Symmetry: D2
Subunit: 498 residues, 4 copies
Amino acid sequence: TTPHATGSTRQNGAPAVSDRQSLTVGSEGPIVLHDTHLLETHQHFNRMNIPERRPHAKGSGAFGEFEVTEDVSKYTKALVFQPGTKTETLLRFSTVAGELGSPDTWRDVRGFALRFYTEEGNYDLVGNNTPIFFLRDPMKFTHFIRSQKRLPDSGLRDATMQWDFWTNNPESAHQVTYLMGPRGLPRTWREMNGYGSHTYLWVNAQGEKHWVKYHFISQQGVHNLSNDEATKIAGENADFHRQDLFESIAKGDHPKWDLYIQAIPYEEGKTYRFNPFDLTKTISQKDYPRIKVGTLTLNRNPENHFAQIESAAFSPSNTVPGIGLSPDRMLLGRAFAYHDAQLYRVGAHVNQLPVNRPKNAVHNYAFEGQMWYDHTGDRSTYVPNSNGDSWSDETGPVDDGWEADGTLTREAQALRADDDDFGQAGTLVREVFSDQERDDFVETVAGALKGVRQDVQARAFEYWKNVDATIGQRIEDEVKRHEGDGIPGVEAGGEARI
Amino acid sequence: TTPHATGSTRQNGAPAVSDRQSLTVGSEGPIVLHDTHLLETHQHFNRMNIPERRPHAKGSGAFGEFEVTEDVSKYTKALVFQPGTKTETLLRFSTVAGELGSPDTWRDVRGFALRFYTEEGNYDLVGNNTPIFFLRDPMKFTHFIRSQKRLPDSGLRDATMQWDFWTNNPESAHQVTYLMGPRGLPRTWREMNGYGSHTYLWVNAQGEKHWVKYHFISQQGVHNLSNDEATKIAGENADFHRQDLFESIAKGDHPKWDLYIQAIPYEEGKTYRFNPFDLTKTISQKDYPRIKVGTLTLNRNPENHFAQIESAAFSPSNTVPGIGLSPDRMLLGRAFAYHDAQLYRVGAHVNQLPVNRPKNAVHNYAFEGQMWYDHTGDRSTYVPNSNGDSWSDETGPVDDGWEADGTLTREAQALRADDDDFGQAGTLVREVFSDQERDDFVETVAGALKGVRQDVQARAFEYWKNVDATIGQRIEDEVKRHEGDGIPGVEAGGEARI
Amino acid sequence: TTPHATGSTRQNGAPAVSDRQSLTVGSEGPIVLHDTHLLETHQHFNRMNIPERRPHAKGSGAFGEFEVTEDVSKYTKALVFQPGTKTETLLRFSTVAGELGSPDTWRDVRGFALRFYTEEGNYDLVGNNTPIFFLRDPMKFTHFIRSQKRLPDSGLRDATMQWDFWTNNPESAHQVTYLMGPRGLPRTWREMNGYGSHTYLWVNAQGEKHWVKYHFISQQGVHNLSNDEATKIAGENADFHRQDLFESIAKGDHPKWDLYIQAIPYEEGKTYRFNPFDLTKTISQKDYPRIKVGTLTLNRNPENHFAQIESAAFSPSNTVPGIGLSPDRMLLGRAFAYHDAQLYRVGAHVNQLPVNRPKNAVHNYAFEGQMWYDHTGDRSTYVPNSNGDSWSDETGPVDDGWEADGTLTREAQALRADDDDFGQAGTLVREVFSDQERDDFVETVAGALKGVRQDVQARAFEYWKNVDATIGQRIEDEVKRHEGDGIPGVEAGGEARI
Amino acid sequence: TTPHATGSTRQNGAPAVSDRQSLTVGSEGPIVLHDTHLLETHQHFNRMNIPERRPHAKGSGAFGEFEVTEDVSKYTKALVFQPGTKTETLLRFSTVAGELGSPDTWRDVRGFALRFYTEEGNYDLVGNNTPIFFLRDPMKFTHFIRSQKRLPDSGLRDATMQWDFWTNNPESAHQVTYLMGPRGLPRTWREMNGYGSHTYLWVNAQGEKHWVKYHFISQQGVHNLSNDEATKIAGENADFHRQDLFESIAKGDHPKWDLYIQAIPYEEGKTYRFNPFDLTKTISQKDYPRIKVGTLTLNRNPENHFAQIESAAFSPSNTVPGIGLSPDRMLLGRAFAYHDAQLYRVGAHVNQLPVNRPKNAVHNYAFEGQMWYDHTGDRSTYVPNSNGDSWSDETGPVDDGWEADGTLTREAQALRADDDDFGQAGTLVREVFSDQERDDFVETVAGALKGVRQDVQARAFEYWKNVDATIGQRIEDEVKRHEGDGIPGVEAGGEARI
Ligand code: HEM
């Protein structure tokens, strides 16, 4: 390359001389302090690792395209969803509880984090493989995730801790049912569905509002593993899902999902018999049918997993005109939490990394900070200014809001006509599952309760009977026989657990 | 507790009001920005995770005691090793390559990181479960560990990458042989040996020097798993070793190790037929027999894994009077690398956390920094000073050094009479292993090579024949039949690997 | 100390050998990499500095006591303010705009950050030396502080930037008037008043609410410097105020302030003719007289400025039972902003440092994180739990809240009968100032406008005439003559400014 | 810009709606948690500040060009210094002790940090405005800089602390003399000289070595301020030097310096009568005359001070082929210290920021880490590899080294024939200074000693008499009369100092 090149450089671009031997006083002498290549390479090595995500540490993803094939402009003005629009995407899939090195095939929720690189900013639909969640207020989320992780003394996951939390938070029943059913163990990420879970707001060009749910239905179908199959794979190939996705795309097999929405008129949000602002509820498709939007295709692997996947930073706060948040307390907490975490995990300038940069021009009032790659030159740092550096100042009601009235309180959401903690779980068990899925569900839940401390087991029997009397008694009977499946990723009992 | 108590507090000690519901405008309204308990708890949640160690992320440990039962005062003045001395200890065990959530029973080196809380400072013997390592110069260490981790695009571990590195760094053969043998898969941490690996310096009260090796021989014996058993356990119980140690201690079964040293007179370090400063070499016990020192017992579990184990920060730089480093280049690099990493991983004041604090008084010229818990009051910040705040100023040759002479160079260490890359590996295969261990070794190495890119396989056949002609041909034959064990933690081949 | 002691230790407690010479190969040879004392001391030196506060970087403080001498229990149940109560305090004083090394005697607001170490938590009254501020919505605060700091290209403070911001944000007029008056240059921190500025909520034992203002009236009186005196001191003694406070306390002269409150009945908050929730307004003492509470005395210097002052972390979120926030948007933003900044500035565990620790027991649901000094042992990490580890779950309206009703909006606060941007500023100029203070005010404002770009000057003449026609014309006349005082800390004009 | 644009964006590129009002429940209601623009802008504001440099916090700079106008190829092969070569440069000037906001015109050393963006990497000559320094071993540097900063309790600079350190470290006398002379107060950065201070190694194309000193002689001459003038300016314009440089360049007045070297043959380094490896010594120009190299011109201001100046990261480790370090212990410590500090101050990827990026291609074995902007794709992470990703492996003696022989020691450097602590200082006072400069020097040193604790004063009288008997007695006489200049930036005495 250069006249004095050696095959590699230091960080300043000068030849490095050797990537294989340190600088010593003769062959037998000590290493000198001024081996600057040894220092730079080791100091960087020592700073490669970054905090893993909490939750959703273990995951991978791919790039692709979304194509709108229907007309939903009467519901939203968002550029990404206008007729015919094609938009580049990034999708990261993940588990929830396990850490960076944990097996892909533990029983768990899966993440479905989808970025659209739109012409009006990065739009992130940060979803999961379920339409609901375990909780309806974000104050509980910290407790839930800690209960899914490790005991403070022994450092082991513990089903007693998990069930102690779930049984004492009965709002969890709908999603625990989903988790313990077939879909707790996707065969591949290509063979699971994605969902927004929350109600979001869509706003059309005239300002009319609808409450919407997102459903990404896999064109590869929904295919799952048994507990025993998933345990075997966890030992044989801890990266089975990561490998599957990369190999599939490398061979030219590009997985697809069709996006559908449900759309509730603004005024009906307040009156519907299930609370659309309660993340533990689904909305009936008889009442609000699915409406097709378009198709997502994944077609391109990362070239650098760490820079393009590990360093990606998704957030529900990354809305675009035509799409807003909703009165769902969980979503409102998420609006804060992701960006906050990313400032620590990645850095203040996380959104300047290529994968997080929008396609359109950023004109944002933020300056300085560590690792400021793309600076603002001599632009004004304040507003209004007399130097022609524009700012925003729209006054009055926003286009993507709603109304509220009351005293400051900490209390449960008011119940709609058909709201409770157990009924939708019961519909899932009784009406949605097949007989074989119910049989497997009993083996799963009974196994998940094996070795759990008996006080917690007794509460779990009541919890499951509240879901469904028959399933609850079947579970109790099997637990009392000390039978049930091993659950990949967690157990109970012994001197190192509760 | 207090007149207005609610059951828990915020970070300022005031009652928190609720750990279960956020502060909203009426039951149905949005969360307010000034829910300071929601903010504090989520912002802390978002900062719980710290960078995992690189390497040795996955591990656990226990506290105990070392008791000296022999007299080695003619070799060292170190307080911890004087006759009859009992000293509190902490031992962290670990794998090497896998991340925080990876299975305990992957094939790998194990760490054996032992702190002695001595009356003259914390003395750390940061060992492994092998007396040797893969490399003899720290410039190569970064490359080696990266080769043991993941491919840059797909994020998969890859045996092709591992073997490409090993075959191109034939100094690795002694330790690769040990790793691929029985001891690559300890049954429990209680049933493996520990070693310092490096030569260290011991200095007696009169200033005489000896070069020493440390050997911690388990009183529970050395017991290992087959590849197939370890794979099965990796799926069924990713924390098998962590659980075993905690349960053992909880039941009152306290594991023990007997410490022995080898002691080489100072002048013989330069002349010995194997280089004692080459980390790829063992020293013959016929030439330098083992000398008993005393016994290590583990007897107490952590009460908080994260604060006492994850936040522990060991370093070979933590020598005490009577114990020094040596001309081993690897050890000299380690003297820098651990403390450096810990400043990033934990923080500038890592050594003020309780687990890292010495028992004796610290009087160190370091002030200020983030998270400064134990400040120095009005003590002088400079030396010499006229205010009675003491300092050190010993001049001339140190008590724990050695000589050097030469020009600044980057080159391999000079060979002693019997030094090479393959001979000690060959003794291990031919003379130490049993017939059954050799049979299993062939199945292990052949399995480890299954699916590896053929150029790299061909280099590996030559590497193994250089270790031993017979074993190398047996391995080659089996690889050419496409037979061999699955290796827990890594594979080769397919569209997502080299 | 120890048998092998040398006068100081390394971080592990072992003797350091020398604080004065590095470890070299002979007297003439290179420094070796394994000079671990050189490495530890330099790596700590390189991590001593922490981000300075933004704003309020330049400051110092002292400890003391608050004594309640009146009965205000009909207004608040807070333990700190019950009859006869004595509470330890910490007070940090500061400027606003200048950085860590800037002169104490620049013209500026001064901070008055007061912690009470109460028996129900740390209560922080984070005040200033003025009862008002420049702004009424926190979205503008970032812009304001940046406008008070440096131009993006040249790195100079610039009065053109300052006035461009102020004139385009006429809500600033009340506080700009106060700043440009006598009190912009306190002689000492002992000779200025402190104020909460915001309306806070006080809640009594029966739950009745009052809106309150805090006033700390110096027993040393209010004494100020001229611009010329303060400029001279800025050159001669950049730490004049820091030195004054430390010397005063060292000699036994303990400064005092008497605390008074104004108390507005809950329902009158909504109806009062000035908006008590607008930080740009004072509340008439004819309408709501001052009510004495007690006396603050400072009596003890820090022993370590960095650990006790620089590392102190105050926050308006640190309320205690009996004291809450208010509908003032600025205060609601502050509830978030301080703790957030401190996580970056100091660390996640900022509130475990001794100066930030409460006196009462903390029982908070936060675990792990870097630099975790005081761990929670095996306490449950989730709620509810079946292990006897308590939590909070009060449901329904909080005791320290209020009501709201409307659509989500971004707009100015509604005007009360007597609200505007200029009238209270005009009362200050016309009715409060003396003739000599008005003369000096003209010289100050005219000087502050010298060299300012003419478009901005023209807007400033209109701004000042809106405050008071007479003062505005006097200022304009003097600016058009190119006369006025030099203002310590800032100027305008030349090729490096707007 | 976009169909729904508002004048500015959030960090994701979506319209921000307002930079001036927060999102509230009606005009009178609270701010909602999901005001994501308020959150992003405040969280960034709270992370703008970065640790200031230690030392050399206060500074500024400009870009320019170096032009070689002579032929020094017989001494170096470095591309930047070959005949006729023109290279872009960046120069940052600074004080040493004061913090980010301190006045530019305090008495102090000035930095002269010069980067050349060469075709073989960034070459940094990190100099000062003096050819010598206070110390000859880096172990003392931490102590020295702390002694130049603030007392641990009161937070004041203290001349007693400064002189306690200097008098107890008599190696300081040469540079203290220079500092206390005329050049302690440059009028502008344009009117001071720059120096490398250390001996560096130059290596020619044939491998022959010379020891070199760098001298940058200002074409604007050397012009200084009196103590009284500099004190006055410190109050009136704390940024006088920063402003001067920016204004000069903005008007088209481009300051210049001529670079000269001294060149000592390799073998004469060992024998010269002053130790060229002792940073407290100059080398006689009668013995080794200055040899012209070329001319530096500054011609371009930053467009963004923070990104281009504050975030610049210079290091003596940034050598290029043809230029190496030397046996000077101070320089060898600097090889480690700068890069280390920058990892904390700026970040692991500091050298990827535009100002720190080389012009030539970087091919460095470092991957991952926070804020990784320019990733390496699928490049191999290890060496040797079988994938065509090059590395370095030069073996044997380096081209830019030297010899050493001895035992590991901590001791002073051996004295050459003419080495001592006081003689060169004495030549400066007696032979270099004029009568008026000597008169001013007495007033400066006597002023610097005013109020210093008497034990330290007595040691200072002996120190100055050792420099020169006459000057020392003149200083003592004046100190005993309680006369001398005020010294800008520091004083002694009173209850807040020693
Ligand atoms: C062993 C002694 C020394 C050590 C350990 C040392 C260390 C440091 C460190 C850590 C910094 C801050 C770097 C950063 O954060 O970017 C610094 C800055 C600086 N030092 Fe040194 N220093 C020493 C001696 C010297 C000498 C002798 C000179 C000149 C010949 C010098 C000139 C400078 C300059 C000019 C800067 C500021 C660079 C800039 O403008 O960014 N230092 N020093």
